[PDB]
């Protein structure tokens, strides 16, 4: 059946685990300073975990 | 006192984690192409102090100035260590037969 192509078009694959945390800590919108610097360095403490 | 050395050491830590910090932003904005391509007031502020931290360490670990004036080098000489004369030194004296004869 693929003789036949009529249209063809290149989706990009989804993220891999590793991009999926950059999402996390950006974006999360936090109220305070202080709490945007604890969210971005539980997120970089997972990452050292990892 | 003699901890400024671990003030930079932290100053310099905390700029290295901070420089780590904007790399994983940046890569976050172009994976998603946003507009705003404006770094977090989080990471800015800690960039900011620890940079001023490391400078005021370091404009202190640097050493400490010295006089100009040279009349204020010698002002604890004495005459007992200047007239020898490390060349000149003679050892036939009394404190041979007197120090271990």
Same mark, same amino acid.
């Given at each position: 059946?693929?003789?036949?192509?009529?249209?063809?078009?290149?989706?990009?694959?989804?993220?891999?685990?590793?991009?999926?945390?950059?999402?996390?800590?950006?974006?999360?919108?936090?109220? =305070?300073?202080? =709490?945007?610097?604890?969210?971005?360095?539980?997120?970089?403490?997972?990452?050292?975990?990892? | 006192?003699?901890?400024?050395?671990?003030?930079?050491?932290? *100053?310099?830590?905390?700029?290295?984690?901070?420089? %780590?910090?904007?790399?994983?932003?940046?890569?976050?904005?172009?994976?998603?192409?946003?507009?705003?391509?404006?770094?977090?007031?989080?990471?800015?502020?800690?960039?900011?102090?620890?940079?001023?931290?490391?400078?005021?360490?370091?404009?202190?670990?640097?050493?400490? %100035? !010295?006089?100009?004036?040279?009349?204020?080098?010698? !002002? @604890? !000489?004495? %005459?007992?260590?200047?007239?020898?004369?490390?060349?000149?030194?003679?050892? @036939?004296?009394? *404190?041979?037969?007197?120090?271990?004869?």
């Amino acid at each position: 059946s693929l003789a036949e192509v009529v249209c063809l078009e290149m989706v990009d694959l989804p993220l891999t685990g590793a991009q999926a945390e950059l999402e996390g800590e950006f974006g999360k919108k936090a109220d =305070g300073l202080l =709490g945007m610097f604890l969210k971005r360095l539980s997120s970089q403490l997972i990452l050292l975990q990892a | 006192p003699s901890l400024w050395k671990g003030l930079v050491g932290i *100053g310099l830590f905390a700029l290295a984690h901070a420089a %780590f910090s904007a790399a994983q932003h940046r890569s976050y904005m172009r994976l998603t192409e946003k507009e705003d391509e404006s770094l977090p007031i989080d990471i800015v502020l800690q960039t900011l102090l620890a940079f001023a931290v490391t400078c005021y360490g370091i404009v202190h670990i640097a050493g400490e %100035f !010295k006089d100009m004036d040279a009349t204020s080098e010698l !002002k @604890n !000489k004495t %005459f007992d260590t200047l007239r020898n004369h490390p060349s000149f030194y003679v050892f @036939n004296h009394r *404190g041979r037969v007197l120090f271990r004869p």
